[PDB]
Amino acid sequence: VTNQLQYLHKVVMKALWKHQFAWPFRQPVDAVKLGLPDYHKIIKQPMDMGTIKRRLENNYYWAASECMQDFNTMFTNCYIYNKPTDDIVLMAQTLEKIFLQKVASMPQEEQE
């Protein structure tokens, strides 16, 4: 447990998890359900906010940067896989804006 990780859990994840556009990102992409046979051919490191949330709850992360990279991977996967005009991209962008706004105010020095 660190101060930055606490911030990421109590401020960033709290804000993103309850957001009206969060629902597509709350669980792993189910390629069978969504009819996306190439999803795992293209996206080699799937990530979602349920995983990140679970990881924060279970003290998985050793540094705040590791959690931030997971958030980034989730969003980046969405941009890489999907078409420019897909609504999911807009939703990801909206959530990522909040992520960045909040991360701007994260504690600067990681103290365990």
Ligand X SMILES: Cc1ccc(-c2c(C)noc2C)cc1S(=O)(=O)NC1C=C1
Of the residues 7, 11, 19, 24, which one makes contact with ligand X according to CB under 6 A: 24
Q: Vertex 15, ends 56 and 31: CA angle to 5°?
A: 70
Is residue 16 part of the contact set for ligand X (CB under 6 A)? Answer: no
Of the residues 8, 12, 16, 29, which one makes contact with ligand X according to CB under 6 A: 29
Residue 65, token pair as written in the block: 């940067």
Count of residues in the chain: 112
* Rounded least distance, CB 19 to its own copies, Å: 17
Sign for the CA dihedral angle at 57, 27, 25, 83 comes to positive
Q: Which stretches of the chain bind ligand X, using CB under 6 A?
A: 24-25, 29, 34, 36, 77-78, 81-82, 86-88, 91
